[PDB]
Write a protein that binds this ligand. Sequence first.
Ligand SMILES: CCCCCCCCCCCCCCCC(=O)OC[C@@H](COP(=O)(O)O[C@@H]1[C@H](O)[C@H](O)[C@@H](OP(=O)(O)O)[C@H](OP(=O)(O)O)[C@H]1O)OC(=O)CCCCCCCCCCCCCCC
Ligand SMILES: CCCCCCCCCCCCCCCC(=O)OC[C@@H](COP(=O)(O)O[C@@H]1[C@H](O)[C@H](O)[C@@H](OP(=O)(O)O)[C@H](OP(=O)(O)O)[C@H]1O)OC(=O)CCCCCCCCCCCCCCC
Ligand SMILES: CCCCCCCC/C=C\CCCCCCCC(=O)OC[C@H](COP(=O)(O)OCC[N+](C)(C)C)OC(=O)CCCCCCC/C=C\CCCCCCCC
Ligand SMILES: CCCCCCCC(=O)OC[C@H](COP(=O)(O)O[C@@H]1[C@H](O)[C@H](O)[C@@H](OP(=O)(O)O)[C@H](OP(=O)(O)O)[C@H]1O)OC(=O)CCCCCCC
Ligand SMILES: CCCCCCCC(=O)OC[C@H](COP(=O)(O)O[C@@H]1[C@H](O)[C@H](O)[C@@H](OP(=O)(O)O)[C@H](OP(=O)(O)O)[C@H]1O)OC(=O)CCCCCCC
Lengths: 29, 734, 150, 39, 35, 100, 71, 21
Amino acid sequence: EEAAAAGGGGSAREGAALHEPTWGVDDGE
Amino acid sequence: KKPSDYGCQLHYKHARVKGTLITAAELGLVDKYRDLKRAGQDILTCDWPYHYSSILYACYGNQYKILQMVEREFVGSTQELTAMHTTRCWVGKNSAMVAAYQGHLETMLYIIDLDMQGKFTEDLFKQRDVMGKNAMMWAASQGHTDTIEVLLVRSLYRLLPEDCADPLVLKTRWKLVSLLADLASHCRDYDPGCSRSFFQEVLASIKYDPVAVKLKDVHITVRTLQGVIVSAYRAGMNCMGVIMYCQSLLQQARYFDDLVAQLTAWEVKLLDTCRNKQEVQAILAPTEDDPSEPVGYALATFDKAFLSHKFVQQIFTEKWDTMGVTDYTKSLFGVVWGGCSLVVAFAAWATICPLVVVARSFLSPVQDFMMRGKVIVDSRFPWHVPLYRWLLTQCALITFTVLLSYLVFSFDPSDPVPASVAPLNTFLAVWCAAILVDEVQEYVEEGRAEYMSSGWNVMDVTMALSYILHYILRIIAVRVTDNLNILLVVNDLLAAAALMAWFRMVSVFELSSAIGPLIQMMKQMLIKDVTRFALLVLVILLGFSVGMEALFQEACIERDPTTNECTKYTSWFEQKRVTGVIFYLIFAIVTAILLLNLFIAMLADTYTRVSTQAMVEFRYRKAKLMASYSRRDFVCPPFNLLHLVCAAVGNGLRRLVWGPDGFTPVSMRKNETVPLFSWYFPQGEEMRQVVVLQRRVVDDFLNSNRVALFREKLNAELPNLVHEMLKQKGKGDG
Amino acid sequence: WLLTQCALITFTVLLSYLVFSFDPSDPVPASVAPLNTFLAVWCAAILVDEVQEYVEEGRAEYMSSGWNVMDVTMALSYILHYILRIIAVRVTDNLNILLVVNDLLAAAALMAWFRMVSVFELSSAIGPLIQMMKQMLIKDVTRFALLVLV
Amino acid sequence: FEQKRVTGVIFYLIFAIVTAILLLNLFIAMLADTYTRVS
Amino acid sequence: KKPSDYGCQLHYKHARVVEPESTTDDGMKRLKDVG
Amino acid sequence: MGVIMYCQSLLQQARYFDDLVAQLTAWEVKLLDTCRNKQEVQAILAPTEDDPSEPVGYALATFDKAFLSHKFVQQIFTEKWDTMGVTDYTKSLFGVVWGG
Amino acid sequence: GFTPVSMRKNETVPLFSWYFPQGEEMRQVVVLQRRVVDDFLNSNRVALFREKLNAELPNLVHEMLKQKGKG
Amino acid sequence: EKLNAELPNLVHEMLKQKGKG
Ligand SMILES: CCCCCCCCCCCCCCCC(=O)OC[C@@H](COP(=O)(O)O[C@@H]1[C@H](O)[C@H](O)[C@@H](OP(=O)(O)O)[C@H](OP(=O)(O)O)[C@H]1O)OC(=O)CCCCCCCCCCCCCCC
Ligand SMILES: CCCCCCCCCCCCCCCC(=O)OC[C@@H](COP(=O)(O)O[C@@H]1[C@H](O)[C@H](O)[C@@H](OP(=O)(O)O)[C@H](OP(=O)(O)O)[C@H]1O)OC(=O)CCCCCCCCCCCCCCC
Ligand SMILES: CCCCCCCC/C=C\CCCCCCCC(=O)OC[C@H](COP(=O)(O)OCC[N+](C)(C)C)OC(=O)CCCCCCC/C=C\CCCCCCCC
Ligand SMILES: CCCCCCCC(=O)OC[C@H](COP(=O)(O)O[C@@H]1[C@H](O)[C@H](O)[C@@H](OP(=O)(O)O)[C@H](OP(=O)(O)O)[C@H]1O)OC(=O)CCCCCCC
Ligand SMILES: CCCCCCCC(=O)OC[C@H](COP(=O)(O)O[C@@H]1[C@H](O)[C@H](O)[C@@H](OP(=O)(O)O)[C@H](OP(=O)(O)O)[C@H]1O)OC(=O)CCCCCCC
């Protein structure tokens, strides 16, 4: 999915169609 | 095996496995239609109970093939072909209605292609039938959403002019027609030899060389309307009027309420892109070049979002009330000095208004004097102020209901014969005669639409028509015939006419903002909610009234020979009967509670719906009123009748004496030889300054849509741009 | 649908003509009249039609319309009115069961006329009054009538 | 006889119903104005 | 064929007569009235 | 459309999932507005030979209010049930007389 | 054959006439349902993510500055 | 409230720099 959603979508559903960020959240404080 | 869990829950449960041209038209046999027409018998053999030709069964049963054979083989001219498609049904449908009366894209696209190419002589899609329906109004009523779009694309194409040559008005004509040519794209012609697409001769004559589809690309979307509003403006048309016209195309379709709400949100975005009044009246004004008024079209099609804006309520106010007399109520000085000037100048009105109407029809220096004013319009020439014409109307309205309630509180059982006519009882019969003349030339001159959707024109007929019918049926029930029960119908016609007059007199509160959206509510939870709940109660009350008779009916059996004794407990020792009538009347009271509870919750729905729109309906009923009196003459309905008589006499004179005189007092209210506002058609070097000032406003509007349609092109790919800035972060590259 | 409703306005006209054109001083053929027994054949054939659309379309579909109850209950009452009138006119002539006979025909004449608001189901503006009165008798009445009773 | 007291009372019933409905319509307009201020 | 669909629906209805020299600025639109 | 109706019938007998029935009823009406004409409405609701799964007759069987009330689902019934326009003859002056 | 059935609710015929296509109608319906519902399913993937980027917006901006911390 | 309504324009300015510099 990281390679199919690398340039717009190779799963033919504009991405891998179940794939997003989740860039990453922090704890801090 | 057995299916899934989803299997036995969603899957399909059951188990499965002639001599006329008409019946060769409906079935679609081309050669059998060609052979029997070479013997013929007609080409318009019409069957009896419904008046269908042999053409209108091809349009019926979706054969564009044999409609195309007749257009190739058996036709001589344009004028002969349109006589075949315009052969009405027994209801009145032509060829284009029947193909839109039921969803037949493949036939509708043939007729439209015959209409783009100019092979007709009448507007085939603009004709009506018995019900006044249209080809676009049948396809919207039945709901065939795939022939509605094909009729939308035709009316958007036909808006754009074919004579101008601008590169963006020729691109978007190519991109509307090729939305239809790609819509058919199958369905070739009947000849298996020379085969060609439908819109061959229309994309050819357009002069434009273009230098897994989605459903964003085969339907009219919001970026397709924006290509029309620009290209209509770029080709030279009123951009405020193209938005109102494309809106009222899409309200006719009933299935594009997501595009109606966008076009409304552009006629409110363009309407407050203006700043001054000089910019409002530069984009709402007609010129010599485009004569299109958009203010008169909005109050013809009842456009409550336009017609109640801050800037539209400002251009009506500076003609209706330029002095602020409507705010001499919120003060003690205003009520005393405004009220005292009203009873003076209504006393002065009723004594001079007959003397002006006589001395204006044949006393020409006065008619040229009464035209003076009406551009200054204010207290210097007070008979042209449209607020003042409304005040005299409401003063001549209360005077009728005082002189009518004095007619009924001053009746006595004292004298029958010299009281049938009176100086009062006959004067109001002339008054009510001149209300009925007023409603005729209101109905005739405007029309049936704005008559029934108005203030109280339907009510003001009945209080005028029943008093006249009181007045006549009292005259001929003293002298012509002697006396009957006809005398007691006379007291009911005066009881209706005295009731309807006092309920007419609450039109003095059309302008109050506290008592205004309270009368319009109470009209609306009385002509909607009560006349549909009374039909329900009449069925329920007639069932209890039948069921009482079946409960009290007798059965008399104590006799030895025949019919001797008979038990009496009717009302419509035997202590059993009252028990059943008590339980029956309890079931009726529970029924009365259950319907009084549904009537009160019915009305509280209507209060919530008419008071979420209190100050938009009010500012729309106000501007339908500020526009009605700005065209209306100062003669109220009691002197409406004197104006018709002196103008019929006084203009018959100046047909014998001097000839091309003109300036006659015209025999109509709501004058036509006036553009509504004085800032309309601006000849001279004010046209050059409007056209500059319009193009400033519209060009700054068209690129705040082009910005706001760019942010939606970025909302569609927001999870694709976040993934690209996150990789352009210094994980990989800086 | 229109022949269903035109055969249903016809039923409550003939039923309400029966209670008005009822002559009391009439012998024992007032029980078996032509009009009194044609309406009993009618309500016989309504009951056989409800057992057909009880077995075919089921039970959860049958008890989800609200008019299938009133088709039974005015048929079952008039067909019991037709029997007990015959018995109470030549077999046992007493006012104990006679006042039941006049009570069934009153019950069967209401549910004829409550059945005739069914023509308004397709009309807008009276259609939503058939549904806000039906849902009121489903949801609300059976929890407020148990407190008015207390 | 002569249908004489019936013609007037069918206007007595129209006038009383279309007034009592018109007051009740105006009392729902006051219950729902004071509700929005109470609440 | 000379009118359009937009034309029948939106243009000014009646036939008027062009005044010879009629201004529409705020003053001088009122020369016939004020004097 | 069958899976959205099936997953909603699951979670409505689960009784403690009302933030998910509100989302699956909102996706059932969002699918039925992506559909633009009648040709696309009856192409997501039609059972083909591959999957013989009707979602219309299953919405009738589980008493679905939000589906059968929709303006594109009220159109497939009235296309088939009327097909002549004789309901719309009762909104004219010359039609109530002849129709009656 | 074609004897009058005593059972009402004719169960042989389907509900609508457009139910089971047999040919080129079946190949067109498949092209129309893939066209519609692939643009239903895209506009839910975007509209769910927008509610994730609303509630977690100061964490995307903080990850764009955290790269100054590492690399 | 400015960054809510104009959020896809901040993300587009972070990618527009790939366009210029
Ligand atoms: C022999 C003479 C005896 C007469 C006996 C009279 C006894 C008192 C009866 C008083 C009722 C007189 C008629 C009702 C007066 C009235 O309320 O206003 C007159 C007009 C109202 O026009 P509008 O423009 O002002 O009011 C709206 C408004 O302007 C909307 O904006 C428009 O929508 P639109 O713009 O989209 O078109 C409406 O148009 P539409 O019709 O299409 O909805 C329009 O009607 O009344 C009518 O149209 C007549 C239609 C029937 C009205 C109901 C009558 C009231 C009586 C009901 C209770 C009877 C119960 C009987 C119980 C025994
Ligand atoms: C004391 C009772 C006062 C009642 C006041 C009646 C006022 C009549 C107003 C005019 C009637 C129009 C509206 C009536 C239409 C109608 O359908 O009648 C309603 C029904 C209510 O049940 P349902 O069929 O809808 O059956 C429901 C329904 O199918 C739900 O939809 C289901 O839920 P579901 O959706 O999940 O399937 C329910 O199952 P559940 O248990 O799960 O909830 C099921 O029970 O009521 C009636 O038919 C009776 C109303 C009129 C009464 C007529 C009979 C009275 C005759 C007695 C006369 C007394 C004379 C005796 C002395 C001589
Ligand atoms: C054919 C004629 C038929 C009869 C029509 C006569 C007029 C009757 C119509 C309406 C008057 C009744 C309604 C008045 C309501 C309250 C009046 C009021 O509230 O007043 C408010 C303002 C105050 O003015 P302002 O300071 O705000 O600005 C004005 C200064 N400016 C002009 C420079 C801008 O306006 C004014 O007072 C000016 C208004 C005062 C005029 C009303 C009293 C006049 C009495 C009799 C006139 C009869 C003439 C007969 C001639 C026959 C034909 C030759
Ligand atoms: C009585 C003499 C008083 C001076 C005469 C001149 C006064 C005159 O003729 O005005 C009519 C008056 C207007 O309404 P009225 O003054 O009561 O007050 C309106 C209302 O109260 C709001 O304040 C305003 O709404 P909004 O918040 O701003 O939106 C509205 O302004 P606008 O919205 O309209 O701009 C106000 O006009 O209505 C009558 O009460 C009946 C009077 C008797 C009429 C019958 C005459 C016989
Ligand atoms: C004489 C009747 C002949 C034709 C039969 C007509 C059969 C029939 O259904 O009409 C019922 C009739 C009129 O009501 P009617 O059905 O016409 O109601 C309209 C109809 O539903 C339209 O289709 C609706 O438009 P749409 O669908 O939403 O687009 C429209 O809403 P709107 O959008 O316009 O606001 C509705 O107003 O109501 C009666 O009084 C009972 C008489 C039943 C007669 C029983 C036998 C005597």
